[PDB]
Short mmCIF file of N, CA and C and ligand atoms in Angstrom, two decimals:
data_model
loop_
_atom_site.label_atom_id
_atom_site.label_comp_id
_atom_site.label_asym_id
_atom_site.label_seq_id
_atom_site.Cartn_x
_atom_site.Cartn_y
_atom_site.Cartn_z
N UNK K 1 14.40 -26.34 18.21
CA UNK K 1 13.46 -26.38 17.52
C UNK K 1 13.05 -24.64 17.02
N UNK K 2 12.30 -24.38 16.01
CA UNK K 2 11.62 -23.16 15.41
C UNK K 2 10.54 -22.42 16.32
N UNK K 3 9.85 -23.31 17.18
CA UNK K 3 8.50 -22.90 17.37
C UNK K 3 8.28 -21.84 18.48
N UNK K 4 9.34 -21.56 19.34
CA UNK K 4 8.73 -20.39 19.93
C UNK K 4 9.05 -19.08 19.13
N UNK K 5 9.58 -19.05 17.77
CA UNK K 5 9.42 -18.03 17.08
C UNK K 5 8.11 -17.64 16.21
N UNK K 6 7.31 -18.61 16.47
CA UNK K 6 5.90 -18.82 15.66
C UNK K 6 5.07 -17.81 16.24
N UNK K 7 4.21 -17.06 15.59
CA UNK K 7 3.67 -16.34 15.61
C UNK K 7 3.04 -14.79 14.93
N UNK K 8 2.37 -14.21 15.43
CA UNK K 8 2.28 -12.76 15.18
C UNK K 8 3.02 -12.08 15.63
N UNK K 9 3.82 -10.67 15.49
CA UNK K 9 4.55 -9.66 16.06
C UNK K 9 4.49 -8.47 15.66
N UNK K 10 4.63 -7.07 16.57
CA UNK K 10 4.30 -6.25 15.50
C UNK K 10 5.42 -4.87 16.37
N UNK K 11 6.05 -4.24 15.36
CA UNK K 11 7.07 -3.55 15.98
C UNK K 11 6.89 -2.52 17.15
N UNK K 12 7.52 -2.87 18.04
CA UNK K 12 7.68 -1.53 19.17
C UNK K 12 8.51 -0.82 19.19
N UNK K 13 9.90 -0.94 18.76
CA UNK K 13 11.18 0.07 18.96
C UNK K 13 11.92 -0.34 18.05
N UNK K 14 12.37 0.90 17.54
CA UNK K 14 13.59 0.92 16.13
C UNK K 14 15.14 1.82 16.61
N UNK K 15 15.94 1.02 16.60
CA UNK K 15 17.23 2.07 16.22
C UNK K 15 18.74 1.30 15.15
N UNK K 16 18.39 2.91 14.67
CA UNK K 16 19.29 2.55 13.53
C UNK K 16 18.86 1.84 12.28
N UNK K 17 17.66 1.64 11.75
CA UNK K 17 17.14 1.55 10.84
C UNK K 17 17.47 2.37 9.25
N UNK K 18 17.30 3.78 9.64
CA UNK K 18 18.13 4.71 8.70
C UNK K 18 19.38 4.39 8.24
N UNK K 19 20.22 4.37 9.44
CA UNK K 19 21.48 3.57 8.68
C UNK K 19 21.70 2.56 7.93
N UNK K 20 21.08 1.49 8.78
CA UNK K 20 20.96 -0.06 7.82
C UNK K 20 20.21 0.31 6.24
N UNK K 21 19.63 0.77 6.39
CA UNK K 21 18.54 1.03 4.83
C UNK K 21 19.71 2.01 4.21
N UNK K 22 20.13 2.76 4.49
CA UNK K 22 21.47 3.97 3.75
C UNK K 22 22.22 3.05 2.88
N UNK K 23 22.90 1.76 3.85
CA UNK K 23 24.11 1.22 3.56
C UNK K 23 23.50 0.44 2.38
N UNK K 24 22.34 -0.04 2.27
CA UNK K 24 21.71 -0.76 0.87
C UNK K 24 21.48 0.13 -0.37
N UNK K 25 21.43 1.28 0.04
CA UNK K 25 21.12 2.36 -0.83
C UNK K 25 19.56 2.83 -1.39
N UNK K 26 18.84 2.15 -0.40
CA UNK K 26 17.51 2.56 0.05
C UNK K 26 17.52 4.06 0.07
N UNK K 27 16.79 4.94 -0.80
CA UNK K 27 16.25 6.59 -1.24
C UNK K 27 15.66 6.92 0.00
N UNK K 28 16.07 8.05 -0.12
CA UNK K 28 15.28 9.09 0.94
C UNK K 28 13.62 8.71 1.52
N UNK K 29 13.13 8.91 -0.08
CA UNK K 29 12.03 8.54 0.30
C UNK K 29 11.18 7.58 1.11
N UNK K 30 11.74 6.53 0.28
CA UNK K 30 11.58 4.86 1.00
C UNK K 30 11.75 5.33 2.43
N UNK K 31 13.25 5.86 3.33
CA UNK K 31 13.81 6.06 4.51
C UNK K 31 12.59 6.76 5.55
N UNK K 32 11.96 7.53 4.59
CA UNK K 32 11.05 8.90 5.52
C UNK K 32 9.62 7.38 6.19
N UNK K 33 9.32 7.08 4.90
CA UNK K 33 8.16 6.16 5.15
C UNK K 33 8.45 5.34 5.97
N UNK K 34 9.49 4.37 6.00
CA UNK K 34 9.87 3.20 6.94
C UNK K 34 10.00 3.82 8.22
N UNK K 35 10.92 5.17 8.59
CA UNK K 35 11.18 5.18 9.78
C UNK K 35 9.65 5.51 10.59
N UNK K 36 8.72 5.44 10.19
CA UNK K 36 7.70 5.64 10.39
C UNK K 36 6.57 4.20 10.70
N UNK K 37 6.71 3.76 10.19
CA UNK K 37 5.72 2.14 9.62
C UNK K 37 6.21 1.01 10.94
N UNK K 38 5.74 0.42 11.54
CA UNK K 38 5.30 -0.39 12.35
C UNK K 38 4.63 -1.44 11.58
N UNK K 39 5.28 -2.55 10.93
CA UNK K 39 5.46 -3.83 10.71
C UNK K 39 4.86 -4.95 11.43
N UNK K 40 3.63 -5.47 11.00
CA UNK K 40 3.33 -6.98 11.58
C UNK K 40 3.42 -8.13 10.62
N UNK K 41 4.90 -9.07 11.70
CA UNK K 41 5.59 -9.95 11.10
C UNK K 41 5.00 -10.80 11.42
N UNK K 42 4.42 -12.16 10.90
CA UNK K 42 3.77 -13.56 11.17
C UNK K 42 4.63 -14.80 10.51
N UNK K 43 5.17 -15.51 11.32
CA UNK K 43 5.80 -16.57 11.16
C UNK K 43 4.74 -17.95 11.71
N UNK K 44 4.86 -19.13 10.42
CA UNK K 44 4.09 -20.17 10.55
C UNK K 44 4.79 -21.03 9.96
N UNK K 45 4.63 -22.45 10.54
CA UNK K 45 5.20 -23.45 9.97
C UNK K 45 4.30 -24.54 8.99
N UNK K 46 4.61 -25.04 8.22
CA UNK K 46 3.78 -26.20 8.35
C UNK K 46 5.08 -27.41 7.17
N UNK K 47 5.19 -28.55 8.68
CA UNK K 47 6.30 -29.25 8.36
C UNK K 47 7.57 -28.67 8.18
N UNK K 48 8.40 -28.90 7.12
CA UNK K 48 9.71 -28.42 7.05
C UNK K 48 9.86 -27.17 6.88
N UNK K 49 8.63 -26.44 5.91
CA UNK K 49 8.08 -24.75 5.47
C UNK K 49 7.95 -24.44 6.64
N UNK K 50 8.76 -22.96 6.62
CA UNK K 50 8.28 -21.58 7.39
C UNK K 50 7.66 -20.87 5.95
N UNK K 51 6.61 -19.86 6.48
CA UNK K 51 6.31 -18.85 6.15
C UNK K 51 6.45 -17.50 6.97
N UNK K 52 7.42 -16.44 6.14
CA UNK K 52 7.03 -15.37 6.83
C UNK K 52 6.68 -13.96 6.00
N UNK K 53 5.36 -13.50 6.73
CA UNK K 53 5.10 -12.67 5.81
C UNK K 53 5.00 -11.35 7.11
N UNK K 54 5.75 -10.01 6.24
CA UNK K 54 5.72 -9.05 6.55
C UNK K 54 4.99 -7.68 6.22
N UNK K 55 3.99 -7.53 6.92
CA UNK K 55 2.80 -6.31 6.29
C UNK K 55 3.19 -5.31 6.73
N UNK K 56 2.64 -4.09 5.84
CA UNK K 56 2.42 -2.80 6.62
C UNK K 56 1.57 -1.87 5.69
N UNK K 57 1.37 -0.58 6.02
CA UNK K 57 0.57 0.27 5.25
C UNK K 57 1.38 0.81 3.98
N UNK K 58 2.68 0.74 3.73
CA UNK K 58 3.78 1.30 2.18
C UNK K 58 4.26 -0.28 1.52
N UNK K 59 5.15 -1.29 2.52
CA UNK K 59 5.29 -2.15 1.67
C UNK K 59 4.77 -3.85 2.42
N UNK K 60 4.40 -5.07 1.60
CA UNK K 60 4.38 -5.99 2.43
C UNK K 60 5.18 -7.55 1.39
N UNK K 61 5.66 -8.23 1.91
CA UNK K 61 6.36 -9.42 1.34
C UNK K 61 6.09 -10.57 2.15
N UNK K 62 6.50 -11.29 1.55
CA UNK K 62 6.15 -13.05 1.75
C UNK K 62 7.30 -14.01 1.32
N UNK K 63 8.13 -14.47 2.13
CA UNK K 63 9.03 -15.40 1.90
C UNK K 63 8.60 -17.00 2.45
N UNK K 64 8.52 -17.69 1.39
CA UNK K 64 8.55 -19.34 2.20
C UNK K 64 9.66 -20.21 2.26
N UNK K 65 10.20 -20.99 3.05
CA UNK K 65 11.55 -21.92 3.01
C UNK K 65 12.01 -22.40 3.68
N UNK K 66 12.67 -23.81 3.80
CA UNK K 66 13.49 -24.81 4.28
C UNK K 66 14.39 -24.17 5.05
N UNK K 67 14.48 -24.64 6.41
CA UNK K 67 15.76 -24.09 7.26
C UNK K 67 17.04 -24.90 6.47
N UNK K 68 18.01 -23.85 6.03
CA UNK K 68 19.25 -24.85 5.52
C UNK K 68 19.14 -24.56 4.12
N UNK K 69 18.17 -24.52 3.30
CA UNK K 69 18.12 -24.56 1.81
C UNK K 69 18.17 -23.45 1.39
N UNK K 70 18.85 -23.18 0.11
CA UNK K 70 19.06 -21.81 -0.58
C UNK K 70 17.51 -21.40 -0.84
N UNK K 71 17.10 -20.08 -0.98
CA UNK K 71 16.10 -19.83 -1.76
C UNK K 71 16.36 -18.49 -2.38
N UNK K 72 15.60 -18.11 -3.64
CA UNK K 72 15.71 -16.51 -4.14
C UNK K 72 14.76 -15.77 -3.28
N UNK K 73 14.95 -14.31 -3.00
CA UNK K 73 14.12 -13.61 -2.92
C UNK K 73 14.37 -12.17 -3.42
N UNK K 74 13.39 -11.77 -3.18
CA UNK K 74 13.18 -10.18 -3.61
C UNK K 74 12.68 -9.32 -2.46
N UNK K 75 13.49 -8.89 -2.28
CA UNK K 75 13.41 -8.07 -0.83
C UNK K 75 12.47 -6.81 -0.86
N UNK K 76 12.30 -6.50 0.42
CA UNK K 76 11.11 -5.26 0.40
C UNK K 76 11.79 -3.93 -0.50
N UNK K 77 13.15 -3.61 -0.50
CA UNK K 77 13.89 -2.67 -1.28
C UNK K 77 14.16 -3.02 -2.79
N UNK K 78 13.80 -4.08 -2.94
CA UNK K 78 13.87 -5.09 -4.20
C UNK K 78 15.06 -5.27 -5.09
N UNK K 79 16.05 -5.61 -4.12
CA UNK K 79 17.14 -6.73 -3.94
C UNK K 79 16.30 -7.94 -4.44
N UNK K 80 17.83 -8.87 -5.57
CA UNK K 80 17.28 -9.59 -5.87
C UNK K 80 18.48 -10.57 -5.13
N UNK K 81 17.96 -11.47 -4.23
CA UNK K 81 19.30 -12.34 -3.23
C UNK K 81 19.20 -13.47 -3.62
N UNK K 82 20.20 -14.43 -2.82
CA UNK K 82 20.20 -15.48 -2.74
C UNK K 82 20.39 -16.05 -0.91
N UNK K 83 19.13 -16.25 -0.40
CA UNK K 83 19.31 -16.31 0.84
C UNK K 83 19.16 -17.89 1.48
N UNK K 84 19.38 -18.23 2.93
CA UNK K 84 19.09 -19.12 3.53
C UNK K 84 19.23 -19.21 5.10
N UNK K 85 18.14 -19.81 5.40
CA UNK K 85 17.98 -19.52 7.16
C UNK K 85 18.49 -20.86 7.63
N UNK K 86 18.60 -20.48 9.02
CA UNK K 86 18.80 -21.43 10.17
C UNK K 86 18.81 -21.03 11.29
N UNK K 87 18.99 -21.92 12.14
CA UNK K 87 18.79 -21.93 13.71
C UNK K 87 20.21 -22.38 14.26
N UNK K 88 20.75 -21.21 14.95
CA UNK K 88 22.12 -21.31 15.40
C UNK K 88 22.31 -20.40 16.62
N UNK K 89 22.57 -21.31 17.80
CA UNK K 89 22.37 -21.12 19.11
C UNK K 89 20.80 -20.63 19.42
N UNK K 90 19.88 -21.08 18.89
CA UNK K 90 18.54 -20.98 19.42
C UNK K 90 17.87 -19.28 18.65
N UNK K 91 18.85 -19.29 17.42
CA UNK K 91 18.59 -17.81 16.94
C UNK K 91 18.03 -18.13 15.48
N UNK K 92 17.48 -17.51 14.59
CA UNK K 92 16.75 -17.70 13.57
C UNK K 92 17.65 -16.67 12.57
N UNK K 93 18.64 -17.05 12.05
CA UNK K 93 19.68 -16.70 11.19
C UNK K 93 19.31 -16.49 9.71
N UNK K 94 19.16 -15.44 9.18
CA UNK K 94 18.73 -14.98 7.83
C UNK K 94 19.64 -14.63 7.37
N UNK K 95 20.81 -15.15 5.81
CA UNK K 95 21.49 -14.84 5.30
C UNK K 95 21.40 -14.22 4.26
N UNK K 96 21.46 -12.86 3.46
CA UNK K 96 21.34 -12.87 1.98
C UNK K 96 22.21 -12.60 1.27
N UNK K 97 22.83 -12.97 0.29
CA UNK K 97 23.85 -12.47 -0.78
C UNK K 97 23.46 -11.90 -1.98
N UNK K 98 24.18 -10.86 -2.41
CA UNK K 98 23.95 -10.62 -3.49
C UNK K 98 25.29 -9.91 -4.28
N UNK K 99 25.39 -9.73 -5.39
CA UNK K 99 26.64 -8.64 -6.29
C UNK K 99 27.85 -8.93 -5.00
N UNK K 100 28.08 -9.99 -4.15
CA UNK K 100 28.76 -10.17 -3.92
C UNK K 100 29.49 -9.72 -1.96
N UNK K 101 28.01 -8.82 -2.03
CA UNK K 101 27.43 -8.55 -0.52
C UNK K 101 26.73 -9.37 0.48
N UNK K 102 26.42 -8.73 1.48
CA UNK K 102 26.26 -10.15 2.63
C UNK K 102 25.09 -9.07 3.30
N UNK K 103 24.18 -9.67 3.61
CA UNK K 103 23.38 -9.16 5.20
C UNK K 103 23.32 -9.81 5.73
N UNK K 104 23.22 -9.84 7.39
CA UNK K 104 22.47 -10.58 7.84
C UNK K 104 20.96 -10.06 8.35
N UNK K 105 20.00 -11.02 9.26
CA UNK K 105 18.93 -10.31 9.70
C UNK K 105 18.72 -11.55 10.92
N UNK K 106 18.67 -11.02 12.03
CA UNK K 106 19.16 -12.51 12.75
C UNK K 106 17.84 -12.02 14.29
N UNK K 107 17.20 -13.15 14.26
CA UNK K 107 16.29 -13.01 15.23
C UNK K 107 16.47 -14.32 16.71
N UNK K 108 16.15 -13.39 17.29
CA UNK K 108 16.45 -13.78 18.98
C UNK K 108 14.96 -13.61 20.19
N UNK K 109 14.92 -14.54 20.70
CA UNK K 109 13.54 -14.62 21.56
C UNK K 109 14.34 -14.17 23.16
N UNK K 110 14.11 -12.90 23.52
CA UNK K 110 14.39 -12.42 25.00
C UNK K 110 13.13 -12.33 25.84
N UNK K 111 13.16 -13.09 26.54
CA UNK K 111 11.87 -12.62 27.60
C UNK K 111 10.66 -11.95 26.84
N UNK K 112 10.41 -13.24 25.86
CA UNK K 112 9.31 -13.41 25.24
C UNK K 112 9.18 -12.47 24.03
N UNK K 113 10.30 -11.59 23.92
CA UNK K 113 10.35 -10.39 22.63
C UNK K 113 11.22 -10.76 21.64
N UNK K 114 10.89 -10.29 20.58
CA UNK K 114 11.39 -10.84 19.15
C UNK K 114 12.39 -9.92 18.93
N UNK K 115 13.56 -9.80 19.28
CA UNK K 115 14.74 -8.88 18.72
C UNK K 115 15.27 -9.02 17.16
N UNK K 116 14.86 -8.37 16.46
CA UNK K 116 15.48 -8.49 15.20
C UNK K 116 17.07 -7.75 14.94
N UNK K 117 17.83 -8.44 14.98
CA UNK K 117 19.26 -7.56 15.06
C UNK K 117 19.47 -7.49 12.65
N UNK K 118 20.12 -6.55 12.57
CA UNK K 118 20.01 -6.09 10.66
C UNK K 118 21.47 -5.92 10.80
N UNK K 119 22.53 -6.45 9.92
CA UNK K 119 23.66 -5.87 9.71
C UNK K 119 23.87 -6.25 8.24
N UNK K 120 24.65 -4.84 7.80
CA UNK K 120 25.29 -4.95 6.48
C UNK K 120 26.42 -3.95 6.51
N UNK K 121 27.55 -4.04 6.11
CA UNK K 121 28.37 -3.33 6.29
C UNK K 121 28.61 -2.69 7.39
N UNK K 122 29.04 -1.78 7.89
CA UNK K 122 29.05 -1.40 9.05
C UNK K 122 28.01 -0.90 10.37
N UNK K 123 26.69 -0.75 9.37
CA UNK K 123 25.72 -0.70 9.69
C UNK K 123 24.73 -1.97 11.03
N UNK K 124 24.38 -1.57 12.12
CA UNK K 124 24.00 -2.40 12.92
C UNK K 124 22.61 -1.86 13.29
N UNK K 125 21.29 -2.28 13.07
CA UNK K 125 20.09 -1.95 13.31
C UNK K 125 19.37 -3.16 14.58
N UNK K 126 18.68 -2.29 15.41
CA UNK K 126 18.10 -3.41 16.71
C UNK K 126 16.66 -3.23 16.43
N UNK K 127 15.57 -3.94 16.23
CA UNK K 127 14.23 -3.74 16.29
C UNK K 127 13.48 -4.85 17.01
N UNK K 128 12.62 -4.20 17.65
CA UNK K 128 12.17 -5.50 18.85
C UNK K 128 10.44 -5.07 18.43
N UNK K 129 10.36 -6.51 18.29
CA UNK K 129 8.97 -7.27 18.48
C UNK K 129 8.19 -7.90 19.05
N UNK K 130 7.04 -7.21 19.35
CA UNK K 130 6.07 -7.57 20.93
C UNK K 130 4.92 -9.07 19.98
N UNK K 131 4.72 -9.82 20.67
CA UNK K 131 3.80 -10.70 20.42
C UNK K 131 2.29 -9.91 20.41
N UNK K 132 1.57 -10.33 19.24
CA UNK K 132 0.31 -10.32 19.66
C UNK K 132 -0.26 -11.78 19.91
C1 OLA T 1 7.75 -5.04 4.43
C2 OLA T 1 7.48 -3.78 5.51
C3 OLA T 1 8.96 -3.83 6.04
C4 OLA T 1 9.44 -2.40 6.08
C5 OLA T 1 8.71 -1.37 4.98
C6 OLA T 1 9.40 -0.62 4.38
C7 OLA T 1 11.48 -1.16 4.34
C8 OLA T 1 11.67 -0.90 3.04
C9 OLA T 1 13.24 -0.57 3.10
C10 OLA T 1 14.23 -1.49 3.38
C11 OLA T 1 14.09 -2.78 3.63
C12 OLA T 1 15.15 -3.65 4.18
C13 OLA T 1 15.09 -4.98 4.34
C14 OLA T 1 13.84 -5.65 5.09
C15 OLA T 1 13.84 -4.51 6.34
C16 OLA T 1 13.10 -6.06 7.39
C17 OLA T 1 12.78 -5.24 8.63
C18 OLA T 1 11.80 -5.50 9.32
O1 OLA T 1 11.26 -6.91 9.05
O2 OLA T 1 11.14 -5.03 10.71
#
């Protein structure tokens, strides 16, 4: 089930996010702001549709999707990607594909905390979110 991911989460730790952003071609100015931003992520369900909001003082995003069904997404850094989200080993796995590249955004619950692992190229970033 997806239900233990649901709720409101705030960033409390981040490792290697600059590497991840630079691997995606994000410019220095955006990387600078992003290194100091602590987003709030809200994940809600209505039937088979999940909505994931990411809010901050610089950028906001919102996506709605059905697990296992491709959707178009315009990311926070303005990539237009083809996305699919699924549950795999109890993790929420979001795969983005564009121009032959791939990145994964994988969420795992460990001791009530939401660990987001971002992988692109050789860059691996780990972000820790705490429940609200
Ligand atoms: C909507 C705010 C999320 C972060 C704000 C600024 C980041 C913009 C630059 C790179 C984004 C790369 C893809 C999105 C990263 C998601 C990180 C997260 O949810 O913690």
